[PDB]
């Protein structure tokens, strides 16, 4: 759970010392971040369902073979589409959780830490999730510094994928 206040406490604890001005600098910076990041997370919460459906449709558009071939890993049947869009919403929910938490900790603990072996065991290409995250980071519709750090979290998920 790599969030700034948690890791500041971990630094001060591993050093064995009290808190210094360094952690207070970390804190006024974190409050500066959260002062826009919480409203941006609320805006993503508002636009979430349409973003999930648009990402799923873009993923079906770029990879049309997954809709066609019979296979339980592919979303040819309906249960594949339910589970599929479920993990689209999982990715978007982890993006909002990292927007609230202020660090990549929630996605690192809920998504990243086992995603490689899961995609290895289940024959899931990570490029599908890369395409979906690219569609989300194109279509989230935020502006300014909140948009840049949202794109930062999504690009972090992309780099963790491939």
């Amino acid at each position: 759970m790599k969030t700034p206040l948690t890791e500041a406490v971990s630094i001060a604890d591993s050093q064995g010392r009290f808190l210094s001005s360094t952690e207070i600098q970390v804190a006024f910076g974190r409050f500066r971040q959260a002062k826009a990041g919480l409203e941006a997370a609320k805006a993503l919460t508002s636009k979430a369902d349409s973003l999930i459906s648009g990402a799923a449709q873009a993923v079906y558009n770029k990879f049309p073979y997954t809709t066609q071939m019979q296979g339980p890993n592919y979303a040819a049947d309906q249960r594949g589409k339910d589970k599929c869009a479920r993990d689209i919403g999982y990715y978007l929910r982890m993006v909002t959780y990292c927007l609230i938490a202020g660090g990549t900790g929630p996605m690192d603990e809920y998504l990243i830490a086992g995603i490689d072996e899961i995609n290895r065991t289940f024959e899931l290409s990570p490029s599908w999730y890369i395409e979906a995250l690219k569609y989300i980071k194109a279509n989230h519709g935020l502006s300014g510094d909140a948009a840049v750090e949202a794109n930062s979290y999504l690009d972090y998920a992309i780099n963790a994928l491939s």
Partner: protein, 240 residues
């Protein structure tokens, strides 16, 4: 069988042998301990730090991962010390690091990674090499982890680190052990046969004798503008 004692060797002057009267700063190694009841994410950071210390960064492959040892550690069935022993006795470590080195160089590598210090002298490498020959690599690692030096510095719950690499007044410390002692030396490199120093960067006859780097000595160039006054005026100086 009478236990053959470890061969005696002389100690060298190292930073780790003196008391350090130091204030914690950015050059201090991050201590990963299990004593603080680590969160599920902190366990993954501790495990990652232990793999980095024992294998090196380039050996943190999915195929080298000891998933059973990690689950035993996360359940509290084994100590961090026992986890370090399990990593240093693992098949991928012995294949990559033991089989590609002599007993002397393997002893040096294990002292650097497990005790977090350099070897005092060549005689210490010889003294540990006979333990490896008599007890195997497993019994050598167990004897290293049972040393008072390991227990006094790391105990049971701390991941080993390079002790006192940087002095508090220096921006440049000692070389990291992973760069100082790579997986194999020149001797095993010659046995493997082949490297192809493929491409050039020519130039047409242009050097022979030049120490180009003035570099540091210059420069001042503060400069000044100088005024004019009469020569006759005793400025020149007249003794008596």
């Amino acid at each position: 069988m009478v236990p053959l004692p470890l061969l005696s060797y002389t100690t060298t002057s190292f930073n780790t042998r003196v008391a350090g009267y130091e204030v914690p700063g950015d050059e201090q190694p991050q201590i990963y301990t299990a004593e603080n009841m680590p969160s599920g994410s902190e366990w993954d950071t501790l495990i990652w730090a232990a793999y980095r210390q024992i294998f090196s960064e380039h050996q943190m492959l999915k195929s080298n991962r000891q998933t059973f040892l990690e689950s035993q550690l996360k359940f509290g069935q084994i100590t961090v010390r026992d986890f370090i022993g399990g990593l240093a006795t693992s098949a991928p470590f012995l294949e990559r690091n033991y089989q590609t080195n002599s007993n002397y160089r393997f002893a040096e590598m294990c002292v650097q990674r497990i005790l977090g210090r350099d070897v005092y002298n060549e005689r210490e490498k010889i003294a540990w090499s006979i333990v490896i020959a008599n007890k195997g690599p497993k019994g050598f690692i167990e004897e290293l982890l049972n040393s008072d030096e390991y227990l006094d510095n790391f105990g049971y719950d701390t991941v080993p680190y390079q002790r006192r690499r940087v002095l508090p007044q220096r921006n440049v410390g000692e070389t990291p052990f992973n760069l100082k002692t790579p997986r194999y030396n020149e001797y095993h490199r010659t046995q493997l046969g082949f490297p192809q120093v493929i491409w050039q960067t020519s130039v047409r006859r242009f050097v022979p004798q030049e120490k180009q780097p003035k570099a540091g000595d210059p420069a001042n160039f503060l400069a000044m503008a100088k005024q004019v006054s009469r020569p006759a005026n005793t400025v020149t100086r007249v003794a008596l």
